[PDB]
Amino acid sequence: TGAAAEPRAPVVTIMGHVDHGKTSLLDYIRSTKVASGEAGGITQHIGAYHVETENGMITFLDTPGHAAFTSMRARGAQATDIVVLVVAADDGVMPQTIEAIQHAKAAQVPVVVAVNKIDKPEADPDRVKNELSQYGILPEEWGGESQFVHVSAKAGTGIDELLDAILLQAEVLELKAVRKGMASGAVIESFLDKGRGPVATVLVREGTLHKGDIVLCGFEYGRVRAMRNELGQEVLEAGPSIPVEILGLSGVPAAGDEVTVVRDEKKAREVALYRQGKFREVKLARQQKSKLENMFANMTEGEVHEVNIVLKADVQGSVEAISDSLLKLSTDEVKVKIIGSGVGGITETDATLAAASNAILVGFNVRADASARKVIEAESLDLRYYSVIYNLIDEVKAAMSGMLSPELKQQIIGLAEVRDVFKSPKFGAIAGCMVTEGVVKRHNPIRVLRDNVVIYEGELESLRRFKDDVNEVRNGMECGIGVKNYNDVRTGDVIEVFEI
Amino acid sequence: ANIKSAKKRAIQSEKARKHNASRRSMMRTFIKKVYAAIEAGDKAAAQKAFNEMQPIVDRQAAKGLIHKNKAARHKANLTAQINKLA
Amino acid sequence: ARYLGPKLKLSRREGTDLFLKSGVRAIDTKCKIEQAPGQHGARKPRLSDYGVQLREKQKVRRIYGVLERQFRNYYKEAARLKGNTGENLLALLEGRLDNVVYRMGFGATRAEARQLVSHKAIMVNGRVVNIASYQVSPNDVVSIREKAKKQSRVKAALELAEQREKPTWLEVDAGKMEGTFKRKPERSDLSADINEHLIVELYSK
RNA sequence: AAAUUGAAGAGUUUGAUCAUGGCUCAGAUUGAACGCUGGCGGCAGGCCUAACACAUGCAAGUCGAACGGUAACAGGAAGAAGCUUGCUUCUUUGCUGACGAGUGGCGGACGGGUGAGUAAUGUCUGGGAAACUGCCUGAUGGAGGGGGAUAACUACUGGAAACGGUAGCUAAUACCGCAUAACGUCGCAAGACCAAAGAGGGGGACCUUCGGGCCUCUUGCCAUCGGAUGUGCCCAGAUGGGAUUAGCUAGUAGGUGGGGUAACGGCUCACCUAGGCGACGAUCCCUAGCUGGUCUGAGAGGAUGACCAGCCACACUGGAACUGAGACACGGUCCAGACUCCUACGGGAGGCAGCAGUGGGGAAUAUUGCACAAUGGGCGCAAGCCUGAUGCAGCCAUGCCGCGUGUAUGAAGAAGGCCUUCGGGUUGUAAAGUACUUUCAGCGGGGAGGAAGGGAGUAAAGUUAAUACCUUUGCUCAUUGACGUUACCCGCAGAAGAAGCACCGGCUAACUCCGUGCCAGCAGCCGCGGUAAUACGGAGGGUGCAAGCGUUAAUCGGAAUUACUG
């Protein structure tokens, strides 16, 4: 209330094809350079960092661009007032970059861009402008108000222009916020900690906070125990501009959503439980449909063989995002499904979950609990943690590829022609043979054919030469053969034995 | 130690420990001289040694290094034995 | 915490008038008094021994407006107290303020009297008592407080009261709208088709 | 006067019966959970599981009236100046209000947490004799004269950090001699031997080296004998089960002597005797903290040991002692182990079973809150500082208790629903209508108590050279509440914002229709379901409870079904 309007620091997100040195732009401004200090060499996580530079104040947010992160780039666009798209003259435009174009226009967020490489001689700006000209986005001096910036990103060259454009682009549009009032906003990323407990990184649209104030995120509710901002361990107050990690919530909330503070917690309890009921009702609803959808007691074909996986990732943002990419590798032949996606770490009921149905237990980042090790070490299971999602997406596929059992044809072991049949009481017949090629074996299957068509098929029961009854006969050595359930032996036909 | 005074107490108790150790070692020495005389059968050496020992088992009692009763037994015990021989 | 539904149903189930309405009307012109509620009211209960005990306890509870928990606690206290337990139960009920307010005629019903109490219209010894179950003692003086004295409910209530049998153990001044709980009522003061010993039997088994 | 003056039975074996005998129900109780539902308040309760592991804050300090002291901030000052001549900013100097770091004193052995270990260096009951015991207390005397050090600091230097190395230098209520020394210790006695410390408040002649002397009172220090409280020790009885455990024991049992403890003692050692325990249960094995009490039962019993209080034991695991009146130390030390954190790679650091909080386990158990205002603890002469003890607040229907969710009037008794032999019955005075009330929630207004003290002055007594000071007791003045928007009282608006849960075949309070058809399903026990199902599922109606109601779990009861009573 009061309709108080105060200026704020613009929240900016950056998108692109992987490798435009999107991270480098931030770290150089931050004077940090945390890049390539982490596993994978690339940024697989989202974070927001506010810096203090003239003129005024500005904060930076970044999301990696990959086929896998469909959700993160979608949510990051609508939350930010200004979007930046990194582009390289060497890279040009790529299908991941055009994917970022749609997120800029659909979120009706104004866009400014920067050329990443002025250092390399084979890199030219004119190529970037013209090729992206075809797309309505990124006009330059054509009356489309969009401005291009040329930065070294390694050289650390201004930048002066890019920074100015960003400040100006936020300046030309009216900045609306309020210093005091009812706090509200969105959640960047949520994860689970062992000592601290469940936490969330929250952008506050209206900037206000207090240790005693009750906060409600999604269907989760609770009082804030403590506040943490970036490196700073404790902050007393937080404005609509700078982001602050929230702590003390009941449980790990959704990867992102609208958060609203309330006066009293008791009034907010019924509301939070109400959202759970709807989410549970649709959960059972989608459960009944998928099972009844087949309209039959089983699958019409032999794809029934499937693989199960168990996943718990430390961060809440990943489990929803990478699972979508994990359902992309799914095929009709082998079906893979996720069971019991966790908010973090590992637990007794999780190891029990993998005990009932055979599955691989994997985590984006996790450590084994003291009670967890006892169960995993006892029963036969597999515990594998992966720093990057790419090494994970490859091996799950590997697990699936192995599952397959296809025999498309075998290699004959030997081929033999039979002559001068003999009579035996046990098998009913013994066909004298002469091996023309290869080696005949006992338990290997055979194909009996006459005039190129197969008269009969079977697997050898007895291979006997003379009274020796040897298990193996080479080529051009007299040999003997008999089999059960074969009535008629005729000369001129050839028996083909083949290994499997 | 974690607390300010806890740190200080450990320092003081170590000083006291080295103080007490020194005086206590001295005292037992002068007690042992008496038992050694006794075991060699000399009245005089053992009485003489008892007279040097007396004031210091008494003093260390007054000073809390030992209790009064300990000082007394030592004097009682040695006195018993030395008299029993000469 | 209070029975809020239809009242004559209760009378109809127990087979008697429970005085849950003012008494301005012959009860038989307001309901089918001699028939239980429901589709099968005409049906007769060939009623077990447990049944007669239950219904008698219900009857007394429904007269005084007491739910089970409080009434059981009333039995416990009657039992603990010296002298006949059954009679002690009725002393305790009859000593309730909502009840006494009704008997002095300040309320047309115990329900109405209870509302008077809850709504801070009743004083005991010139002190405001607003809880219905307040136990009233010999020599206490309960009164309508000055501001509640012009309520027309109270005048009507005192008129009807004047037409009921007049209780011995209360001295009521209708003009002042004050009255005095002289003494605990004896057993002989209270209706004789209440079977306390049945209620006593129900709660000992 | 009163204060254990109290005790129920039902269903189910059979065609039926009586007996036998188990199963099952009605009852109370719970640190509960789950399902449906959910308005307010008072009081209580809240990790029963992993004695699993823990990020972060906080949970033990305080005294300048013991001491050298200034680095912070605060004034003050010869003298620098802000100078617009009384307002002042900085250079200086501990001059003082205070106070970081340091020595020193007292407290860190209490308060708080847990129940792992322990069938006995435990607990309970009742007794013993060989002992110590800070602070507080009564008694009687000391409190003399000296000495060598040291942290801080200064200079030089090593470390990433933690924390060091050299040499200087200095104080004390730190530390040590010497004297003094009995109603003390040793000794038959004669004799021999043992301690200490100052610091403040005020002041009359008197005066100096202007520090004080000296006068005076407060307080601390030493000795010895007591009191009080605390603690150590010893004996007897009782305090779980198992013989599908019957033998156990070399410090073992005792004796002598030396040593040892605060003290008795195989506590320890040497020597000697050959004992000691055990079917009245030793040894071994399993389990477990004990009690007051708690729940149940008419009782006798049975079950049990959260919350409150007493004792014990433990403090990451195993071991150890140092300091101290007290510890083998919950936020001390050392060693070893398990584990974790920091690191510039060389080295460091830590222990939530304190209060919050986190991960984990689980069917399941709360906020990283406010305040020292009150009671109580530590330090201090005090003022005061510290106190996650405690007082309070938040969360959860977890339980107990209270209250509300309206009161009265309202008939051919409407519409709708339900049953019906279509006559009518019912839901039902229920609803609508009509008046009427306003608790509680909402909103404004006012306003107890938990506050005793402590602070300035004042006056009187005891003091004393003294009207100082000190201390006690009266007087006035101005003040101290985290809870707090307190309890409670007054006003405003309108029935307005406040009803669900299980059950209805017998046991067992509550019956009909439709659907289904040995299916779908119910089910505490018997037992329901194949065309009339009061037993399934829906409906209408009804019964029982009610901010709860059901289901599950759990102890005792009924069970005279371990029977001492019986």
| CATH, residue C111 | 3.10.290.10
Q: Say if residue A55 is preceded by a cis peptide, omega within 30 of 0.
A: yes
What is the largest distance, in Å, between two alpha-carbon atoms of chain A? Answer: 111
- What is the spatial distance, in angstroms and rounded to an integer, between the CA atom of C46 and the C1' atom of D423? 29
Q: Judge if C142 and C107 occupy the same domain.
A: yes
SS3 C94: helix
- What is the spatial distance, in angstroms and rounded to an integer, between the CA atom of C35 and the C1' atom of D313? 73
Evaluate whether residue C45 is within a structural domain. yes
- What is the spatial distance, in angstroms and rounded to an integer, between the CA atom of C93 and the C1' atom of D505? 38
- What is the spatial distance, in angstroms and rounded to an integer, between the CA atom of A424 and the C1' atom of D403? 104
B38 Cβ neighbours under 8 A, 6+ residues apart: B46, B78, B81, B82, B85
Evaluate whether residue C59 is within a structural domain. yes
Sign of the torsion formed by the C-alpha atoms of C165, C170, C171 and C174 = negative
Nearest to A29 by CA among A133, A168, A121, A158: A158
CB A390 within 8 A of CB A352: no
Q: How far apart are CA C139 and CA C170, in angstroms?
A: 10
Residue B60: which nucleotide is closest by CA–C1'? D194
Q: Say if residue A159 is preceded by a cis peptide, omega within 30 of 0.
A: yes
- Measured between alpha carbons, how far is residue A364 from residues A253, A389, C30 in Å? 18, 7, 76
CA A345 and chain centroid, separation: 18
Which contiguous run of DSSP H or E holds residue A416? strand A411-422
- What is the spatial distance, in angstroms and rounded to an integer, between the CA atom of B23 and the C1' atom of D136? 33
Q: Judge if C124 and C60 occupy the same domain.
A: no
CB C160 within 8 A of CB C178: no
- Distance between first and last Cα of chain B: 56
A22 is in an annotated binding site: yes
- The residue behind tokens 């025999």 is A407
- What is the spatial distance, in angstroms and rounded to an integer, between the CA atom of C110 and the C1' atom of D411? 25
Residue C119: which nucleotide is closest by CA–C1'? D439
CA angle A359, A322, A188 (to 5 degrees): 130
Task: Give the CATH number of the domain where residue C88 resides.
Answer: 1.10.1050.10
Residue C111: which nucleotide is closest by CA–C1'? D407
Q: Judge if C111 and C168 occupy the same domain.
A: yes
Token digits of residue A147: 């401005």
Token digits of residue A139: 């006009």
Evaluate whether residue C1 is within a structural domain. no
Indicate the number of domains in chain C. Answer: 2
Buried b (16+ CB within 10 A) or exposed e, A400-434: beeeeeeeeeeeebbbbebeeeeeeeebebbbbbe
- What is the spatial distance, in angstroms and rounded to an integer, between the CA atom of B8 and the C1' atom of D384? 24
A311 Cβ neighbours under 8 A, 6+ residues apart: A319, A323, A338, A340, A341, A342, A362, A363
Which contiguous run of DSSP H or E holds residue B55? helix B43-62
- The residue behind tokens 């900037």 is A207
SS3 A92: strand
Q: How far apart are CA B2 and CA A435, in angstroms?
A: 91
- What is the spatial distance, in angstroms and rounded to an integer, between the CA atom of B24 and the C1' atom of D191? 28
A62 is in an annotated binding site: yes
Buried b (16+ CB within 10 A) or exposed e, A297-323: eeeeeeeeeebbbbbbbbbbbbbbbbb
C51 Cβ neighbours under 8 A, 6+ residues apart: C45
Q: Are strands C122-124 and A478-482 parallel, antiparallel or unpaired?
A: unpaired
Please classify residue A288 by burial: count the beta carbons closer than 10 Å to its beta carbon, then call 0-12 exposed, 13-18 middle and 19+ buried. Answer: exposed
Protein-covered nucleotides of chain D (CB closer than 7 Å) are 7-8, 26, 28, 39-40, 50, 52-56, 60-62, 101-108, 131-133, 175-177, 184-187, 192-196, 222-224, 258-263, 322-325, 329, 331-333, 350-352, 357-363, 367-369, 394-396, 401-411, 413, 418-419, 425-430, 436-439, 489-491, 499, 507-512, 540-547, 549
A83: β partners = A13, A111
Nearest to A2 by CA among A177, A149, A169, A163: A177
Q: Judge if C72 and C108 occupy the same domain.
A: no
Nearest to A312 by CA among A280, A338, A284: A338
Evaluate whether residue C18 is within a structural domain. yes
Residue A233: which nucleotide is closest by CA–C1'? D56
A17 is in an annotated binding site: yes
Evaluate whether residue C163 is within a structural domain. yes
* Domain housing C101: 94-180
Q: Judge if C70 and C101 occupy the same domain.
A: no
Please classify residue C22 by burial: count the beta carbons closer than 10 Å to its beta carbon, then call 0-12 exposed, 13-18 middle and 19+ buried. Answer: middle
Token digits of residue C114: 């209870």
Name chain A's partners: 3 or more CB pairs within 8 A.
Answer: none
Q: Judge if C106 and C86 occupy the same domain.
A: no
Order of strands, sheet of A430-438, starting from the edge strand that comes earlier in the sequence: A453-459, A445-450, A494-499, A411-422, A430-438, A478-482, A462-463
Instruction: Mark out the alpha helices in C44-190 (DSSP H runs).
Output: 49-64, 68-80, 85-94, 97-103, 110-118, 152-163
Strand ranges inside A27-153, DSSP E: 47-51, 58-62, 82-87, 111-115, 148-150
DSSP characters for C108-129? SSHHHHHHHHHTT-EEETTEE-
Q: Judge if C77 and C55 occupy the same domain.
A: yes
Q: Judge if C88 and C125 occupy the same domain.
A: no
A66 is in an annotated binding site: yes
CA angle A294, A300, A305 (to 5 degrees): 95
Residue C200: which nucleotide is closest by CA–C1'? D8
CA A128 and chain centroid, separation: 31
Q: How far apart are CA A216 and CA A197, in angstroms?
A: 16
Q: Judge if C176 and C198 occupy the same domain.
A: no
Token digits of residue A350: 């999780």
Q: Judge if C70 and C129 occupy the same domain.
A: no
A125 is in an annotated binding site: no
Nearest to C15 by CA among C58, C50, C48, C49: C58
CB A139 within 8 A of CB A113: no
Q: How far apart are CA A118 and CA A153, in angstroms?
A: 8
Q: Judge if C80 and C111 occupy the same domain.
A: no
CB C53 within 8 A of CB C202: yes
Instruction: Mark out the alpha helices in A331-412 (DSSP H runs).
Output: 348-356, 370-378, 389-403
Q: How far apart are CA A307 and CA A338, in angstroms?
A: 9
Residue A265: which nucleotide is closest by CA–C1'? D395
Residue B28: which nucleotide is closest by CA–C1'? D259
A136 is in an annotated binding site: no
A87: β partners = A115
Q: How far apart are CA C58 and CA C48, in angstroms?
A: 15
Evaluate whether residue C2 is within a structural domain. no
Nearest to A239 by CA among A290, A185, A286: A185
Name chain C's partners: 3 or more CB pairs within 8 A.
Answer: none
Token digits of residue A13: 């997100």
Which contiguous run of DSSP H or E holds residue A106? helix A95-106
A116 is in an annotated binding site: yes
Q: How far apart are CA C10 and CA C58, in angstroms?
A: 9
- The residue behind tokens 């718990």 is A312
C49 Cβ neighbours under 8 A, 6+ residues apart: none
A449: β partners = A494
Q: Phi and psi at residue A200, in whole multiples of 5°?
A: -150, 145
CA A258 and chain centroid, separation: 24
- What is the spatial distance, in angstroms and rounded to an integer, between the CA atom of B14 and the C1' atom of D269? 33
CB A31 within 8 A of CB A379: no
Sign of the torsion formed by the C-alpha atoms of A100, A103, A104 and A109 = negative
Q: How far apart are CA A51 and CA A443, in angstroms?
A: 76
